[PDB]
C-alpha cells in the first residue's frame, strides 16, 4: 500500500464513502475509530476490537507521554507492538487533553508540549496518522479570543508540518492532518481552512466542536465549515459522537469520527440500540432474556441476555464492562457500515430518515 | 453420558488420574476448577475459561442467592444458560461464606440457610455437583468444639442427602458430595469419614482446611485424612490452593481443587510462572519484553509482554485484569495437565520433585 491515499468511491449530497490506504492497512470511510486512553481500548483485546469491524484506533497521546512514556514505548518497539494492534493508529496531538503555562512556544503543565515535541512523541509512538498540535478553543469564545487562538493554531500547524517533514522516516511512512479552529464563527473557520490548505495536509479535522455547544450549533457550524476544506481529502470531526451526531455529520461531509461515548457510556450501563440507548442497570431489565439489541450481529447479542449483563453491571463485575463495550463498539461499526452501504447505493438520505424515526 | 461415573485410569502412590463423566461433560482428574463469585469467572468470557482447559467451574452460591437470587436464576433458565457455560458446574453449599444466628436448623444472617434450603438453591441454580451443607469449623479449634461442629455437620450431611434424594429431577441429573470435618484431629476425621461413607455420597470433600493452618499442617492432616475416604470416589480439597499446595495434595490423594488465588492474586499483579510467582507491578518489569512465563502456551504469553501487562496493571486498566487472569488460569490448567500425564506415565513423584526444585 502507499503511505497515504484517499479515494472516494461514491457520493450523495455532501456525504462520501471511500477508502484511505496506508502502509498498515485500509480504512473504510466514513470511519468510526475506537479510543484507547492508555494503550488499550478499554476492556477489549485488540482482536476483539478488530472483530467488531474497526479499521483504525485512536491512541491517547496525553496519557501515553505520561504513562508509560513516549521514549519508553519507542524502546519497546512502538505502540503497535506494545499493545498488539498491527493496523493504523491515529494519535491526537495532546493539545486538548492538557488544557498549565501557555505561551507561543507551547504548553507546560502539571512537563512541556510544543508543536515540535508533540510531533516527536507521535513519532516515538509509531503513529500512522499524526495530528497537528493545536489549541482547542474553549466554548463559548468571544470573537477576539477565538481569533487569537485560531491564529496561534495556524502558526502551530506550520510548525507541525515542518517538524513532521524534517523527520524522514515519519514523513515517508505516516500521514499528517491539520486541524481547523475558529469556534462557531464562519469568517474565522474560513481563514483557518485557507491557512491549512495553503500549508497542505493529508487530511483535515474540524476541531473546536464537541466542547459543549449542542447538536444544533455543531451542525450549523459544520454546514459552513466542512465545505471550506479540500474536498479530495478526508474530513475528521474530533470528539463526535453519539449515533445521531454521526449520521448528521456524515450528511454534512465528515469522513471520520472518534467518541469515548460507546466505551465510557458502556461501562456506566448505557447500551446503544436501534431504538435508542438503554441503561441496562434499570430494574426493568432484571429478567429480560432478550439481547441488548434485537438486530445486532455482535457476539454479545448472540450469547447473553440483558438480564445477565444487568446483573454483571449491577455487581461491578469486569465481564459486564467487557460485554457492554464490545456491544457498543460493534453497534457503532454496524452503524458505519449501514452508512457506507447506503451512500454507495444512493439511499443515505432515506437511511438517515429511517434511522432517526426509529432511534427517537 | 451417565449422571455420574468416576473412573481411575492410573495411579502412583496415593495419586490418581482419571475421569468423572456427567451429563454435561467429562472432568479430567486431578482437576482445577476456576471460581465464579457472581455468575462469572472474573474478567473472562466462558469461552476463554474453556480455552484454558477448564472442564468444570465453581458457582459461588452465597453470592448468588443474594445477587441475583436463586429463584430469579431459575426463572431465567438456570445458571448454565444465564452465564453461558454449558459444562459441569459445582456449587458450594453456602455453609462457609456465610460464616449470623446459628442453630441446629441452620443459619440466619445479615436471610436463612438450612441443609434443605441450600440443596434447594443449588437445584434452582441447576448445579451439576451439589455440596452438602456443612459448618466449616474455625481454626484453631479445641477438640470439644471441633467435635461438636463435626457432629452437627454429619447430621446436616444426612439432611442434605435426604433433601437431594427427595427431589427427583435433582437426584437423577446431579451429583452430591459430602464434606469431611474434624479440624486437625485424626479421630474426628475418622468419625467424619465413617459417618459420610455410611450415608453414601458421589464424592467426598475434605473440608475445614485452607483456613489459616499452614502447608505443613494441612499436609499432615491430609496424610491421615484422605485415606479414610472411599478410594473409589473423588476427593475434593476445598479452597486449595497455590501450585505447590496442589502438587502435594495430589501426592496425598486429592482429585479436585478450587482456589480464588489465580483470579484474585492476578488482578493484584501476581502472575504464576514455573520459576515461581512474580508481581508484575514491580518496576523491574517495566521494560521486560518477555512473556509472563517462558514456556506457557497461553494466548497471553503468545501475544503480550510483561512490560505491557505491567503498564496495564499499574494504570488500573481492565485489560490488565483480563490478561493476568487468563494467564493464571491457563497456568493452573497446564499444571494439572502435567500432573495428569505424569501420573499416567508413572513419573509423578519425579515431576513433583522437578516442579519444586524450579518453583522454589
Ligand atoms: N486536537 C484536538 N482534539 C480535540 C478533541 C480530542 C479528540 C481525541 C482524539 C484522539 C484521542 C483522544 C482524543 C476533542 N474532543 C472533543 N472535542 C474535541 C476537540 C478537539 C480539538 O479541537 N483538537
Ligand atoms: N463448604 C465448605 N467450603 C469451604 C470453602 C469454600 C470453597 C468454595 C467452593 C466453591 C465456591 C466457593 C467457595 C473453603 N475455602 C477455604 N477453605 C474452605 C473450607 C470449606 C469447607 O470446609 N466447607
Ligand atoms: Zn450487540
Ligand atoms: Zn501464559
Where are chain A's structural domains?
Answer: 1-360
For ligand 2, atom 2: residue with the closest CA: B96
The full DSSP string for B90-141 is: EE--STTT---EE-SS-EE---EE-HHHHHHHHHHHT-SEEEPP-----SS-
Nearest to residue A136, comparing CAs of A175, A100, A164? Answer: A100
Cis? peptide before A210, omega within 30° of 0: no
Instruction: Indicate the CATH number for domain A1-360.
Output: 3.20.20.105
Determine whether the annotation assigns residue B296 to a binding site: yes
Beta strand B107-108 pairing with B112-113? antiparallel
Query: A263 C-alpha vs ligand 1 centroid, how far in Å?
Result: 16
Measured between alpha carbons, how far is A93 from B359 in angstroms, rounded to an integer?
46
Nearest to residue A153, comparing CAs of A254, A56, A220, A238? Answer: A238
Measured between alpha carbons, how far is B239 from A101 in angstroms, rounded to an integer?
56
Of ligand 2's listed atoms, the one at least distance from the Cα of B208 is 22
**A62 near B CB under 8 A:** no
Contact A322 B318 (CB under 8 A): yes
The ligand placed nearest to the CA atom of residue B264 is: 2
Contact B43 A318 (CB under 8 A): yes
**What does the block give as the cell for A106?**
507551547
Measured between alpha carbons, how far is A44 from A321 in angstroms, rounded to an integer?
9
Exposure string of B8-19, with b = 16+ CB inside 10 Å and e = fewer, is eebbbebbbbbb
Q: How far does A293 lie from chain B, in Å, by closest CA?
A: 17
Choosing from A238, A245, A254, A264 the residue with most ligand 1 atoms within 8 A of its CB, the one to mutate for a pocket test is A238
Q: Are A240 and A221 in contact (CB under 8 A)?
A: no
Catalytic residue from among A55, A202, A258, A293: A258
Q: How far does A110 lie from chain B, in Å, by closest CA?
A: 18
Residues in chain B with CB shorter than 8 Å from the CB of A312 are 38-40
Of ligand 2's listed atoms, the one at least distance from the Cα of B131 is 1
Beta strand B203-206 pairing with B235-237? parallel
Of ligand 2's listed atoms, the one at least distance from the Cα of B207 is 22
Determine whether the annotation assigns residue B134 to a binding site: yes
Cis? peptide before A124, omega within 30° of 0: no
Q: How far does B13 lie from chain A, in Å, by closest CA?
A: 42
Q: Give Cα separations from B195 to A160, B154, B233, B235, B311 (angstroms).
A: 81, 7, 15, 16, 53
Q: Please confirm, yes or no, whether B216 is among the known catalytic residues.
A: no
**Reported resolution, Å:** 1.6
**What does the block give as the cell for B128?**
451439576
Helix, strand, or coil (residue A100): coil
**A74 near B CB under 8 A:** no
Cα R_g (chain B), whole angstroms: 20
Measured between alpha carbons, how far is B96 from B208 in angstroms, rounded to an integer?
9
Please give the residue of chain A at the shortest CA–CA distance from B323.
A45
**Helix B186-199, helix B215-225: angle, nearest 10:** 50
Measured between alpha carbons, how far is A2 from A208 in angstroms, rounded to an integer?
31
The phi and psi torsions of B235 (rounded to 5 degrees) equal -115, 120
Nearest to residue A3, comparing CAs of A170, A174, A185, A154? Answer: A174
Rounded-to-10 torsion of CA B125, B130, B133, B139: -110
Helix, strand, or coil (residue A137): coil
The phi and psi torsions of B167 (rounded to 5 degrees) equal -120, 100
Q: Please confirm, yes or no, whether B258 is among the known catalytic residues.
A: yes
Catalytic residue from among A55, A92, A202, A255: A92
The full DSSP string for B167-216 is: SHHHHHH-EEEEEE--TT-HHHHHHHHHHHHHH--SEEEE-S-SSS--HH
Determine whether the annotation assigns residue B80 to a binding site: no
**What does the block give as the cell for B77?**
433458565
Beta strand B101-102 pairing with B89-91? unpaired
**B276 near A CB under 8 A:** no
Neighbours of B257 (CB within 10 A): 24
Ligand 1 neighbourhood includes A134 CB (under 6 angstroms): yes
Please give the residue of chain B at the shortest CA–CA distance from A46.
B319
> Cell 436463586 sits at which residue?
B70
Neighbours of A47 (CB within 10 A): 11
Of ligand 2's listed atoms, the one at least distance from the Cα of B94 is 1
Contact A304 B84 (CB under 8 A): yes
For ligand 1, atom 21: residue with the closest CA: A207
Contact B67 A311 (CB under 8 A): yes
Q: List Cβ neighbours of B160 (8 Å cut-off, separation of 6 or more).
A: B93, B115, B118, B119, B130, B132, B133, B176, B178
Measured between alpha carbons, how far is A320 from A332 in angstroms, rounded to an integer?
18
Contact A315 B38 (CB under 8 A): yes
Strands (E), A281-334: none
Determine whether the annotation assigns residue B259 to a binding site: no
Measured between alpha carbons, how far is A250 from B338 in angstroms, rounded to an integer?
57
Helix, strand, or coil (residue A269): coil
Ligand 2 neighbourhood includes B238 CB (under 6 angstroms): yes
CA angle A32, A36, A38 (to 5 degrees): 170
Amino acid at each position: 500500500r502507499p503511505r497515504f491515499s484517499f479515494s472516494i468511491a461514491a457520493r450523495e449530497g455532501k456525504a462520501r464513502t471511500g477508502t484511505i490506504e496506508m502502509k498498515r492497512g485500509v480504512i473504510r470511510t466514513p470511519a468510526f475509530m475506537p479510543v484507547g486512553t492508555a494503550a488499550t481500548v478499554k476492556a477489549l483485546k485488540p482482536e476483539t476490537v478488530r472483530a467488531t469491524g474497526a479499521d483504525i484506533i485512536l491512541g491517547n497521546t496525553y496519557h501515553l507521554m505520561l504513562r508509560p512514556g513516549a521514549e519508553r514505548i519507542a524502546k519497546l518497539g512502538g505502540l503497535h507492538s506494545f499493545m498488539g494492534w498491527d493496523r493504523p493508529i491515529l494519535t491526537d496531538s495532546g493539545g486538548y487533553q492538557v488544557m498549565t503555562k501557555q505561551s507561543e512556544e507551547g504548553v507546560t503543565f502539571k512537563h512541556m508540549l510544543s508543536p515540535e515535541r508533540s510531533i516527536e512523541i507521535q513519532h516515538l509512538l509509531g503513529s500512522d496518522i499524526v495530528m497537528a498540535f493545536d489549541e482547542c478553543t474553549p466554548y463559548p469564545a468571544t470573537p477576539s479570543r477565538a481569533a487569537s487562538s485560531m491564529e496561534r493554531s495556524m502558526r502551530w500547524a506550520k510548525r507541525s508540518r515542518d517538524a513532521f517533514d524534517s523527520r524522514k522516516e515519519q514523513a515517508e511512512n505516516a500521514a499528517l492532518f491539520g486541524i481547523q479552529q475558529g469556534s462557531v464563527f464562519e469568517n474565522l473557520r474560513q481563514q483557518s481552512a485557507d491557512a491549512l490548505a495553503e500549508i497542505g495536509f493529508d487530511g483535515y479535522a474540524v476541531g473546536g466542536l464537541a466542547v459543549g455547544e449542542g447538536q444544533d450549533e455543531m451542525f450549523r457550524v459544520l454546514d459552513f465549515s466542512v465545505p471550506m476544506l479540500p474536498d479530495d481529502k478526508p474530513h475528521y470531526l474530533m470528539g463526535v459522537g453519539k449515533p445521531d451526531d454521526i449520521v448528521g455529520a456524515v450528511e454534512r461531509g465528515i469522513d471520520m469520527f472518534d467518541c469515548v461515548l460507546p466505551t465510557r457510556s458502556g461501562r456506566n450501563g448505557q447500551a446503544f440500540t436501534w431504538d435508542g440507548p438503554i441503561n441496562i442497570r434499570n430494574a426493568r431489565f432484571s429478567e429480560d432474556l432478550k439481547p441488548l439489541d434485537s438486530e445486532c450481529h455482535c457476539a454479545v447479542c448472540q450469547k447473553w441476555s440483558r438480564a445477565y449483563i444487568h446483573h454483571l453491571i449491577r455487581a461491578g463485575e469486569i465481564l459486564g464492562a467487557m460485554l457492554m463495550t464490545e456491544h457498543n463498539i460493534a453497534f457503532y461499526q454496524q452503524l458505519m457500515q449501514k452508512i457506507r452501504d447506503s451512500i454507495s447505493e444512493g439511499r443515505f438520505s432515506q437511511f438517515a430518515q429511517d434511522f432517526r424515526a426509529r432511534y427517537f
